[PDB]
Design a protein around this ligand. Sequence first.
Ligand code: HEC
Ligand code: HEC
Ligand SMILES: [Ca+2]
Ligand SMILES: [Ca+2]
Ligand SMILES: [Ca+2]
Ligand SMILES: [Ca+2]
Ligand SMILES: [Ca+2]
Length: 278
Amino acid sequence: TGVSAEAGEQIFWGDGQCSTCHKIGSSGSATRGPDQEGLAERAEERAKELGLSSGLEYLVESIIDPEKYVVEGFDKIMPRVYDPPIMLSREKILAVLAYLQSLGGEPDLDAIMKFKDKIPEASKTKVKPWVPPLAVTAEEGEQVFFDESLDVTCGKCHMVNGKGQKVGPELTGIGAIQTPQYFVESILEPSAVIVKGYETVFVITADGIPYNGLIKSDTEEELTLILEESGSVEEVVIPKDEIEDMKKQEVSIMPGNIGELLSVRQFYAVIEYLRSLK
Ligand code: HEC
Ligand code: HEC
Ligand SMILES: [Ca+2]
Ligand SMILES: [Ca+2]
Ligand SMILES: [Ca+2]
Ligand SMILES: [Ca+2]
Ligand SMILES: [Ca+2]
């Protein structure tokens, strides 16, 4: 579809998967990444701060090297879309760049095209295929995921296609977005990345009772937290009137000992399951 901003808009809201994480003002509802309304103008500001040549160069860097600069308030969750699974072609990334420049600015197609030699070609990805050291299947991993008899049951906290229970984020479709490496890190190092909105907060009530957990809901009169302990979850409803302090923290309520609770086989099975959630 070429390299125009109109083509980039279809890709951003389509095969580029950008809108599964990024909203744009009132269009879309995703929150894993920042709202991209006015991105073009704050790209100029980032480029100034980071000593880059132009806002566009910052936009390029944000795609080709998402880890190189991490927007305040977010963790290293953005994938390299020219790598699997997304495997976004080079012409499509050039189009997306044109769309990003349109978010509060004007696309500059000549200037975008000079960056073509910096955009990796998806077909030429260097990522090695994922081959687990054991034969496992996604179906086997689905069984593990929802197995209430185990010492950890992903389904107690995650929903997939209407099955499971909501504590952490819904995992439907994450296999089309994320890498096996991200699944490994998510399972064995759960606080390395905290999905936006699923932070733990420390609450102290006026009476001096502590509650530490994630926010399920937040009304004018009630704060409902989900607490975790030894793989179990429980809700507490805290009157807003009685809250003395509330501080966000960097621990995830996802258990930190899953490497002790899953076998090697179960672990690689679950990963095959996540990869399959397209
Ligand atoms: C969820 C897994 C995401 C995907 C899919 C996309 N993005 Fe993303 N992006 C995400 C986060 C959490 C952040 C902030 C952390 C960081 O890496 O800086 C970003 C950031 C950007 C930016 C910079 C925004 C800024 O305010 O400076 C850009 C320009 C950007 N992302 C572009 C972008 C594109 C074009 C995507 C589809 C090809 C895309 N992102 C997907 C999370 C996620
Ligand atoms: C409740 C006590 C949980 C259990 C049991 C499991 N997970 Fe979890 N997970 C939970 C939360 C609150 C979050 C968000 C905060 C964070 O740690 O990032 C997550 C996150 C994930 C992710 C990242 C999702 C994303 O959108 O990027 C993954 C891939 C994930 N969790 C996988 C996973 C697996 C495979 C589990 C069973 C072995 C599992 N989780 C259990 C809370 C809880
Ligand atoms: Ca970045
Ligand atoms: Ca995590
Ligand atoms: Ca009140
Ligand atoms: Ca706890
Ligand atoms: Ca209790």
